[PDB]
Amino acid sequence: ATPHINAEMGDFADVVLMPGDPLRAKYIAETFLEDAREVNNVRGMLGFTGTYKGRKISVMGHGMGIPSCSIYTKELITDFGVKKIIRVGSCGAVLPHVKLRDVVIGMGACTDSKVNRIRFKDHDFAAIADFDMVRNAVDAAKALGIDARVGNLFSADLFYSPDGEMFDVMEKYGILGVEMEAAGIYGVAAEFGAKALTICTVSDHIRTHEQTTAAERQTTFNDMIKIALESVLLGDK
Template structure:
């Protein structure tokens, strides 16, 4: 019992040391993590399942990769990213999630490669001693993902997104119109925190997002499609992971 406790570093992840690959793909939905593991990885094994936040490790084209859910929101991804980076030897985390599109040129099922992540949250101000931290992606991951998207013929956009604390924001369309004016491509709830954790710990992070709904046109995918599709984004993240 005592020996097992020494091998399990956190109350949030019950994997053992060495169970995670250096690169982790991180969707918000743990069932999407399971979908990726079962449909894209080989020699897969589940390595964690605390609170049903499923994590798996396998191989893709011969390279060891892991995939694990993050849950919704910046507090949740901050916990998992911090522990993976600081305790499990993970070097890179790529969030693979969904976003609400804001620009007319951003269409349903397009992939957004988040060069930066603005936020209305104070999460990174706490890390940056009250200042405004520029939450940006690791350049190597960013450049590689753009190259791979072009090679794969995936319709994509590169630019700024925004990570919000509130899904149901009382400011409503007034807020989204301001984001749109500032050329924000999409809105989601995790990337700014992931970029902040990676910077704090000297690690690498990237956020890839599939447009699952559009704020201004009202188009939207159903929950099953969100869980089991997003194939372009998944392939892009896998090809990026094995290239860096």
């Protein structure tokens, strides 16, 4: 067991899907995994392992923000043999042409956190995904009839930011979505020699809120999870 995960080596697959909400991890296990078993419940941060089309897979919540996900991702890599992390999230769009319910893949992640400056001598660390994982997700999405948008996410520390003008800067530089974790996960992956990817669905536009239904949100979430799971199978071959 590690400080935040009451499990032992072997309990996790070598790839872990991670939504922010642990209750979505439970939903993924129930909906997509065969022979699913709960393998963590410390702090309510539910984690599960089962199989998808014969492939051992785990899913576990990461909590909100770079500091939370950095803990779990580090422990998974250093103590549970995890080689790949796929964050499966929501993001808010700053570009009108990026549509509600689009799938975005963060090949890079911008941020207003200091964590990568702390790592990288106050220089600019380009927080990036693993290329093969990116391509596997693009290809899995294409096989499901989806053209994933590949580019930069922006990982914010403040959900309630006092700097609304920054969203205009994000738009100018082509940021595809705003979320709260990718850059931190990518920094951990680089620090500890593993591989990561963040996939998000566009849940809103930052500038002007758009309504969605629970059913629409569920189906779009499910599409993202299928992309993520199928991408793993492509990566295995």
